[PDB]
Design a protein around this nucleic acid. Sequence first.
DNA 1: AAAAAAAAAAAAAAAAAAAAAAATTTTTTTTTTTTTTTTTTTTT
DNA 2: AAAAAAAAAAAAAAAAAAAAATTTTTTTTTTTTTTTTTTTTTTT
Lengths: 49, 596, 619, 587
Amino acid sequence: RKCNTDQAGRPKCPLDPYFIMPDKCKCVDFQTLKLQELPDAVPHGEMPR
Amino acid sequence: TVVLDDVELREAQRDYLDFLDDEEDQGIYQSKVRELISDNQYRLIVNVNDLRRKNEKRANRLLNNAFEELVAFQRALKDFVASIDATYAKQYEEFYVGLEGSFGSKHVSPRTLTSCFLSCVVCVEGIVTKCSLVRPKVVRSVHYCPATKKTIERRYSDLTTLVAFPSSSVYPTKDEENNPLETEYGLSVYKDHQTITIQEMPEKAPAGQLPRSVDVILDDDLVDKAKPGDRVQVVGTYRCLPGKKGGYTSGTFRTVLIACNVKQMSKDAQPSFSAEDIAKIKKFSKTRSKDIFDQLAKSLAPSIHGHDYVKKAILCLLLGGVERDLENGSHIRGDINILLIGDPSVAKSQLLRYVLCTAPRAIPTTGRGSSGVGLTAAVTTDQETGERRLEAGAMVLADRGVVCIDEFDKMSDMDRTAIHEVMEQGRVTIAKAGIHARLNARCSVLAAANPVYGRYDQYKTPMENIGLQDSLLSRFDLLFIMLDQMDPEQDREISDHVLRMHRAAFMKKYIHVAKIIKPVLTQESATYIAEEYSRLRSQDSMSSDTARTSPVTARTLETLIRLATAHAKARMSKTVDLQDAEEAVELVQYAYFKKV
Amino acid sequence: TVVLDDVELREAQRDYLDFLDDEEDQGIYQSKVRELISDNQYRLIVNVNDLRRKNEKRANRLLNNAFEELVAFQRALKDFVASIDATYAKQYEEFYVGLEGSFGSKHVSPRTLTSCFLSCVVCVEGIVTKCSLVRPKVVRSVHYCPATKKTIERRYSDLTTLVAFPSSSVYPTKDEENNPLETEYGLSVYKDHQTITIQEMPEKAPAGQLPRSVDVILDDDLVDKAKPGDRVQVVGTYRCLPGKKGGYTSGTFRTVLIACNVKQMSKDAQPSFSAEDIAKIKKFSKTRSKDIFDQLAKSLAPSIHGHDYVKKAILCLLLGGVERDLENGSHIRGDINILLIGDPSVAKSQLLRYVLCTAPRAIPTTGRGSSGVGLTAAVTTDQETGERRLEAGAMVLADRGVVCIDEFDKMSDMDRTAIHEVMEQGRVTIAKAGIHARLNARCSVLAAANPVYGRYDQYKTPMENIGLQDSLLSRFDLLFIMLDQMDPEQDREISDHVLRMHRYRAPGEQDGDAMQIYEKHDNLLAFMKKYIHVAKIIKPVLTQESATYIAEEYSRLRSQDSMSSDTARTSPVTARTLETLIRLATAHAKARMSKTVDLQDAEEAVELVQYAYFKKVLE
Amino acid sequence: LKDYALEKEKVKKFLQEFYQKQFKYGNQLVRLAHREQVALYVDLDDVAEDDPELVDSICENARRYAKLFADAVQELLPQYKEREVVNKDVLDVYIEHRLMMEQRSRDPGMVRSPQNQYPAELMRRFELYFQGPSSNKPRVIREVRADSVGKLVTVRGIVTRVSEVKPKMVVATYTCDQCGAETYQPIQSPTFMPLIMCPSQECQTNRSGGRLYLQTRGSRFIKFQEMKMQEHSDQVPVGNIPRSITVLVEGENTRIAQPGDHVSVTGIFLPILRTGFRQVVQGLLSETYLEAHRIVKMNKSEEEDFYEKLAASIAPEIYGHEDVKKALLLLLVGGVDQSPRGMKIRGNINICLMGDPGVAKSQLLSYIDRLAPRSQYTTGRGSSGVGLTAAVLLTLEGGALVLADQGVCCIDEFDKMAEADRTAIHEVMEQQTISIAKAGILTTLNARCSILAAANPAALLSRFDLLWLIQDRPDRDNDLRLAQHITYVHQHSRQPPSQFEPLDMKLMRRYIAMCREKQPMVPESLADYITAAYVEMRREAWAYTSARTLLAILRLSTALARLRMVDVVEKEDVNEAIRLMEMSKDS
DNA sequence: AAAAAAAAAAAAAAAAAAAAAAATTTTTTTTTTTTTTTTTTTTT
DNA sequence: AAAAAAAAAAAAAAAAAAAAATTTTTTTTTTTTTTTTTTTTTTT
Ligand SMILES: Nc1ncnc2c1ncn2[C@@H]1O[C@H](COP(=O)(O)OP(=O)(O)O)[C@@H](O)[C@H]1O
Ligand SMILES: Nc1ncnc2c1ncn2[C@@H]1O[C@H](COP(=O)(O)OP(=O)(O)O)[C@@H](O)[C@H]1O
Ligand SMILES: Nc1ncnc2c1ncn2[C@@H]1O[C@H](COP(=O)(O)OP(=O)(O)O)[C@@H](O)[C@H]1O
Ligand SMILES: [Mg+2]
Ligand SMILES: [Mg+2]
Ligand SMILES: [Zn+2]
């Protein structure tokens, strides 16, 4: 929430100066899986975790 | 700030201008730039294979870095077309490039497209699923001050996948001294804007998997290039969209594909024309004309033995008649429809699949594969804007083409009642509460059906062997019977041919030009067809033990006219002569009379 | 937000393109453009009366709202000078428009520079007070990234007067990849910048009131055109300044005057000529070259009677001798210096006021008005940098000029000795611990002393009767003795002259209420300035005959026999008197426009000294 | 906008290929590699001898090319390096150790970040400067303006003040309290902020502080001096005061200029950003200094009868006074400074010209001022108070006497000076020092100067070594001769041709220095004769004199030996010295 | 004519005015995706 | 005639987006004041 680049004798950059440059990033995939308790491993009376 | 020196940009524009020059080396891109100039187009298309052939390192830079190299490319094109022409380059303000060819590792599907290809030029297969309403995005907005009588013009830029601050995208509403403005819409500039949603092609996805989809963005001269259900292949830049002003970011960067080119399936290949093609087809037209149709039908589907008359009829449907439209608004259709029917193992589905492989705009369907709403059009609800919407069925997609129905007898009767529209009119009058429509579905129908009782009963009349009514058989212009004649020489030749085949392009060229051709019929043929149909419309035409197959009608006369015109299209004569009329007479006679 | 068209700007630029278009007229502004192109100067001075007569409405508009109007003017100027020469017009990113003329209501003084004249080109006379260091200001700054082999040119807009934003004021130092950027100072572009402070003149200002001053920002083209103490007329745009950013403001708006041009208000650098006037001077010289010195001498200082030798001598001063700077810098002066000593009411001070009004860069010094540190230069610290600056004195201001010393007798011995090196070598070598310098004041001195006892006693010797040392009277090169003979005959002479001048009136201009080479020969009775100004430059070398004659006459003067008994010397004949002979000879030859000092001028010089120096004390 | 790599290869080509045939710059590069030379001076005339457009680029863009030349020579040193340096300086030991350890842990294939490197100036141990092209015209400090910023100007002026050599940071060095890796911070601004946290890879990986501490020991400094140069009087316009430029000196250019001398600086004009001020105008202003690349001292700050020959060549404008000229030449050459037990005796003559007006006392005085190597000139109340002595500005800076230390002070209107200035002058004559004890100052400044005085008519006789009455009295023949001389001067702007042309001032200063460096002895043989002469003049004066008179005779005799240029003091030397004293008496 | 005393000048130090400089995340909304339920239309 | 597939409509929840926001302190500048030097002026 602060532009650190200070230039003397000049008014400062505003309060929330930063915008996320999308061209220059490093991005990697990600997958949100759902795992379930093994049906054999589940006890008799119980819903799977 | 303004850049004064840039080794990368300067060498990029130099290399591009060198490549796009091409006049000294075979004039490929000289011809292409002259073509887009004459045709008044400004989105060049560039073979990346040729780019690799000339300057391979430049190609790798282009692929592995998209936006910079593409900006350099489009500006080099601007300078190049500026050299070749002045007023044209002044008129059009920015000259786009699109990419094409082979994209080895980057030719992917929406499944294999990972984040590894971010900011790079991908070539994505797969169908279309969404098509947004096309909208103009303002790019140069002119305003007029009523009080001051001065005109200003704010500008904008394609900040689609780059950093964007509010200053760029402000739009004026007040003058510097609080004197409200009036925008000049006409003097402004605009860029249409559409967004489609490609999905992995339904067959190519691994089975039992929810499919993967990728969004695509489209702009000027690319918006109405692909409707839903198009087997598109989009070449474009895969990038990230910035989630607007944050203060907290999850780091989850949504992605799009800014399309730099859009293509359909290559089969609709009407432009494939060249000197060799015209030379050979002119030879075929001129050196022989009395046996064009016979030779062509003989070589039509070489794999299946015999079926001489039926294959001739297949060719009649393929070429088509001539659509005769009237000044009054009446329209007499020009397209033949055919119903194969025969014993099992008489290659009915193989003729169908032959048409599906060869003809342009050929749509498969199987008996209960499509039920009504699939075959004809359907009316759904948008569910976002509330309005209705039309979903084009197989027939509508097949307009000016062919639909091949397999297991036509086992198709439900409701579907046939639905296609009662199309089988003569070529139009579907779909309608629900909020939308009435009349959709051009003008396309031939080839069909395959097995007879009732599983196999054709040789000792019963065709009306009893067919589980279809006089109405339906009349809607079909042609009905054909095929029976496995178990004669010794027949079995010898069919099995020999089958084993022989167990051990074309000129036709594709010929079919669509012949379809373009529009002959007209002679008075000799006119009298001949009138008296021949009069001969047919009589009990004396038939005899005991030779029952008719379909209820003979003015439809029978009309489809004889279509057959004669189709044979004229085959002959390229532009004159439906007595030869064509006689041949159609023979065809309709054999198709309509069968023994008992 | 580029403007497509504005009727106001288009109209104004068309009007001023017409105004610059001078071919159907006499070609004045076209000639101005051509000469400034030849000069490489890039400001053109447009007379406001010209603008008013050709279009009064545009003059009203411009003198009411300057900056955008002058933007139109300067764009028209760039287009016009491009049509004359596109190559030169491409050379400078801007060209400028100075002003001149009758700024009738727009002529005020810094006391009367009210808040009515904002954004209006105001005209204002006044004295400078400060001269800030002329330091660069960056306008277009170029940078080089060595990591990426990149170059950039950040651009700056001279928003000295408008609103200025940090986005405009950024000086880049890193690329997008956070690489280091190295400034390219040479490839960048700069313009000088100086602040000064004009002040209401104390001769003009109200008597009992504090000074009032206005700040003036001279950007490029006007760097050193105004030093402290100078009289200067500044014409330019009074405006407001932006307070630096901050959520609060008091209403205060400290204001400036961004000068459009500044000119020397002295109006004494006046060589204004025409070719006809040059020919007039040339004929005036050559036709009667031999009598021309006496023509000038009789002419000079009308409204006074007799004193013909003194008029000749003041001509020798004003025309000047010729300064000599030999091979090794042995600088032998070329100025005359005259001491009027004489009874009261002998128009000595009137001669002084004459040369004050006529000679360019003339300045008065009183006995105890000016004093030493005031007379010659001074050294004082800054107190804003603790550095020793130099404050040029009266003589240094009068370098290559005239100083009129009223009541020279009353300057105390300290100042009378402080004037020594300016009297001889025309320099003041000043120094204190920080800074030292040799300020150059090649001055000329006309000094009106008064005698001891308040009036000359005829029988007493001049050395007794002058309260001045032989030491100083050596340095003075002429001492002229002006006695009031009190005879009725010469009294009739002087009286008729004086009362005629009391009767002379402004010809026709007045009714009864009180406040060309030759002159129209008014019975009751300009080119002087023209001719003496051109005369100053010539270096008439001495002939062999003149040098031998002047040498022998000097030897005669040195010998005591040349003065008879009953006469008393007024100034001892040191070698300064010989150099006086040479300088007076050169001044006479310069009057003649000779190009050589001849025996005529030599004998005139010897006549001058023989009358001036040796006095006949009577018994 | 030129390919700086291409230009770098071109400057390499020039440095390697230049000759004159001796390979000037090649030999200098060998000396550099051996560390027998701490600064290299490029000559732009030599550059333009092959590539004038390169000189054009340098002059239009100097500091860039200072950097490029420095980098190119750095790259070129190992090519010419022959044998290992002897590691003279602790700095050289540091660079050798750093090169050792980086080569040890280099991992030659491996690639490292740009900041994991030694700052390019940290390893130089050689400066590079430019000697400006003769094609450029020496500017004037008013004319050098914003359009010269970043350009290699050539300027001339008098140095009026200079600070003492202070050490200036160029690359601060720091050491972590964790990772044992030095850190380096280059310096460009006049001021800087010192780092706190460590950017070393180990510190960042371990996520420890690494609060690095500044080391004055492993850092680089360069000698830093600043001088205030200003315009000559002659090139000021008519009404103005001379203008000044702040020159900044560093490296081997320091300790050249001292307050008073005349210099010519080839220097890169540059700005400095203005911070800590509240002006009117927006944008960026800049105090401008002049980086000094080449300081030179110009003009006065650079034959059996040789005595009479040189003596008649002083001030050939002024006529006559030939024996005054002889005495003045002795005042310039000086005597000898002997070093006996406990006492030291000054060896400087003092001369006073008491005279009638209009005898060119001031002309002789000014000629001495301009001729003498280290000279100063005072005229009455121009330089009084603390104009002769020193005052504090804090820093103690000298007046006329301190400037003329080891030199000549030329005082005009000696009689009319203030009482305090007269007292200070008396002390300088007696002991060659000024003992100031004012409010802000307590000092014993060393003011070693021969004093030449002018005045017009007891303290003077008692103090001074020689005192000359020059009184004009009229005479027909001699005033004719003077008139002929001065009028010839006013005609031809030159002296009348004597039998020999007067010698040039440059050669004059050369011979004065040569004579000054030739201290002879007084023999033991001549003690008898000189004692005899002294006692004789005591008889004559008894029928003013004192031990000062004997010391004057001795100093003049030693000066005469110096001028005679060989051997020790002799009969002829004492004879001529007593003749000069006797002619002062006859005056 | 030179010494003593006084006045003014030069330079350093201090007190207040007024214009500049610096610091500075968290809670609510709301669109979009997904699921669920009742109904009508169509098929067995 | 009963079953079921599809359609539209309604609701919940998670991700992204929206919106709200002056006060205290420091530093330059100006202006006077005081000390001490220098200068000038009056006295014997
Ligand atoms: N006349 C023929 N010549 C060659 N092969 C034939 C012929 N008739 C049928 N076949 C073969 O029968 C096989 C399947 O026939 P198909 O098209 O499925 O007929 P149906 O649709 O009646 O089952 C194909 O492999 C085809 O080659
Ligand atoms: N030579 C003269 N010719 C004419 N009028 C003179 C002359 N000398 C003096 N006067 C008159 O006497 C007055 C003396 O004034 P001013 O010169 O100021 O005093 P002073 O002569 O004592 O310097 C002048 O106004 C002038 O009118
Ligand atoms: N012997 C001489 N030869 C040449 N010029 C002389 C001589 N004596 C005097 N002068 C001239 O007299 C002028 C005044 O001399 P100046 O320097 O004032 O002496 P002072 O300063 O002692 O009065 C000078 O321009 C000088 O050239
Ligand atoms: Mg089948
Ligand atoms: Mg003198
Ligand atoms: Zn560390």
